[PDB]
Design a protein around this nucleic acid. Structure first.
Length: 289
DNA sequence: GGTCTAAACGTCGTA
DNA sequence: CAAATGCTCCTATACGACGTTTAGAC
DNA sequence: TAGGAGCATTT
């Protein structure tokens, strides 16, 4: 059975909290307002959603161009809020969550059926995700956006949180560089990486502290990068062996481990072994069918 | 000087 | 009835993931 | 992915 913190970490990576405000003649305010919580991933990972569904006893699963689990009814969203109240997010999405949570309450209490409550909801939405559209700005001018929590000083709550987060945002890849100064003509590097927009760096340094390795690379986005071979060998691999990666990325992880094994035994320093590794790499990640 | 590891630096396409 | 929400389709860019060059240990 | 918008159906 999946851990709640794994769920929170994974949602921390890939999930979305949303508020839809659509023009509607039938409403007294002229507008329809509704809250949503959703996770999308890839058809190949429908099983992950089922585990979440199995955990919560709630959520609607769909599969088409992608795989999604959604929470749209008040009871289900109530379940979601109860969960994150018990097992809180630690990325910036917590702030979105908090905006979402305020709106939900406004909606739960039917205060959204007033001009006042509707306007307040828009103040919440303005700071939520992408904020208010041009159309909504046009329809509701002089809207002042609700204050948004800057999330800071947050501790890693649990190793399984890390497993879920890495299952969302992490990457295990093999870097091959053409380089004449090597006998094989190529440098081979095993790389572990986590990518995130420039906003949770306090958190990122904390992941470095928690795993006790890696460096920060800044490009709009920040990367946590582990390249040290026996940091990978003596820190990362035991960690994810105990704290399991979920989804197809688990398989990519396994292949990555295998190549790390080959590298440790210096097989990357031979032509045949280099061909082997190239062959494995070609079957990893995006090249996986 | 040769070989190598680590990582700083560069950057494209679809999920 | 209109309020809630079931259900489906649309858009495009934060992402993952792939490549090269440099500092420097041995 | 991430976030989005809106018609159809149920309550």
């Amino acid at each position: 059975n999946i851990s709640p913190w794994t769920i929170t970490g994974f949602a921390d990576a890939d999930s979305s909290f949303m508020l839809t405000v659509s023009k509607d003649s039938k409403r007294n305010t002229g507008w329809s307002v509704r809250p949503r919580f959703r996770i999308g991933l890839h058809n190949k990972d429908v099983t992950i959603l089922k585990s979440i569904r199995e955990y919560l006893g709630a959520g609607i699963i769909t599969s088409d161009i992608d795989a999604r689990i959604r929470f749209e009814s008040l009871k289900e969203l109530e379940v979601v809020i109860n969960h994150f109240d018990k097992y809180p997010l630690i990325t910036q999405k917590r702030a979105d969550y908090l905006l979402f949570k305020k709106a939900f309450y406004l909606i739960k209490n039917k205060e959204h059926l007033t001009e006042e409550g509707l306007n307040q909801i828009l103040t919440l939405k303005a700071s939520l995700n992408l904020g208010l559209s041009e159309e909504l700005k046009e329809a509701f001018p002089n809207t002042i956006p609700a204050e948004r929590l800057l999330v800071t000083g947050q501790e890693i709550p649990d190793s399984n949180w890390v497993a879920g987060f890495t299952a969302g945002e992490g990457s295990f890849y093999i870097r091959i560089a053409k380089n004449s100064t090597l006998k094989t003509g190529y440098q081979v590097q095993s790389v572990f990486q986590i990518t995130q927009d420039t906003r949770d760096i306090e958190l990122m340094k904390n992941l470095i502290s928690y795993l006790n390795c890696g460096n920060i690379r800044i490009r709009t986005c920040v990367d946590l990068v582990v390249t040290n071979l026996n940091d990978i060998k003596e820190k990362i691999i035991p960690f994810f062996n105990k704290n399991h990666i979920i989804g197809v990325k688990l398989q990519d992880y396994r292949d990555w481990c295998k190549v790390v094994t080959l590298i440790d035994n210096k097989e990357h320093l031979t032509s045949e072994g280099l061909e082997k590794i190239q062959k494995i790499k070609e079957g990893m990640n995006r090249g996986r069918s």
